[PDB]
């Protein structure tokens, strides 16, 4: 595993495809503000009712089933309709509950959404708040994904960690944690990748050409500073909890 | 502004991305037949099979939130449509999503995916809700190209639009060697992706777009021409 770093892979195309097809429409602001808007029989804003009906309807088809999804809403999961799928085994019961979709939720409106875009409003409040969700399950994924980084590399050598966690030594954790390939050089590949975007196999174009509102390089630093951080504190909860 | 002919230009390039990255999601998954199946599942309060249960949710969603009050955008379910001048108001009429939800599932999917089930009905079927209204917005498009040139040169059409001769206006549209590069394009683009052979067909693409997605578009703004005078 290995069979991770395809997934982690995934989860960051997934990611800066979201983020660029945000960055398509301005900041919109009433898309985040209930007194903008009076959605009729529902308290909240824009992107809180799209992001909560989709997660009904994606509960529906069990998609919190899955151990690496996680709802923003878990108070208001809806029943499914589908046969369950078998549940996961493969993290560790006591650790695997860490939910910090309130933290991703805070990060992506106030530090990542208002760098990203610009401060105007062009009125698309329905396709922002859509791919503000589109944004906000993504970012979920990868992030959360930390707990499965975190179960690899303690699997491969328990003690290294095992002493570290008795003591409930966070920063010893954080130390003995290695960020190497996919964790690393995150700013440039990311950058990159969005820059890519669109173009034909080989097509190298000029900046001058770009056909994408987003700036790859801002794309690319907020990625590498707002989402990485929040990742190795997952690994890093994960692990604390990973003898309980 | 979003519907000058350069502008227009610009969207539809931007979409061959946007159904190519749909197609490569959904890809990422096997066909997972039961979807499909009227029989398959126990839906309560619904008949139908999971991608039309899919499809008629989100649609109620977006309804409310006003998508298919824009021009360019077309409800699978325009009978089950909830409640919340580019165009000549015949546009308002053409909608040929039954075309393209059948291209779609019948001849697109089997050949996109892996015959086999891998149990991810739910991943598969929201990625089919956002492959059919990406075909659906690109398609329909093709109202934004044909009024935009409707409206810089009347003259090229209105005798066309009197006689009603559809043939005639679909070949004022046709431009071999444009569609040509539009195919190769599009197959390079899906290309770009690379290889999990590829992660989404570089010839299913081209043949997407040459045996159905410009022909339909085509259908499309001849529709629209022909009632451009009423
Ligand atoms: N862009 C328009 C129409 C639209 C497109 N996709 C949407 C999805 C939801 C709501 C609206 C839309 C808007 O934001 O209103
Ligand atoms: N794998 C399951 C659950 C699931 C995971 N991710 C999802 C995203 C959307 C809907 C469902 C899911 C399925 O596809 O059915």
Known sequence: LANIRESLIRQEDTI?????????????????????????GFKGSLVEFMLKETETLHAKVRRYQAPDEHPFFPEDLSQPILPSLPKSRVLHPAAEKININKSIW????????????????????????????????????????????AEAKFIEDPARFEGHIKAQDGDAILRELTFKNVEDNVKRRVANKARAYGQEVNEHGKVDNARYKIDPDLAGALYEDWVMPLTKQVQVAYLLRRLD
Do not use: W
């Open 16 to 40: 800066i495809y979201a983020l660029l097809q945000r960055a398509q429409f301005s900041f919109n602001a009433p898309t985040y503000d209930e007194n903008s808007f009076s959605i009729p």
């Open 106 to 149: 805070s990060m992506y409106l106030q530090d990542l959404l208002p760098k990203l875009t610009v401060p105007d409003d062009d009125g698309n409040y329905g396709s922002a708040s859509v791919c503000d969700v589109l944004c906000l399950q993504a970012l979920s994924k990868r992030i959360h994904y930390g707990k499965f980084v």
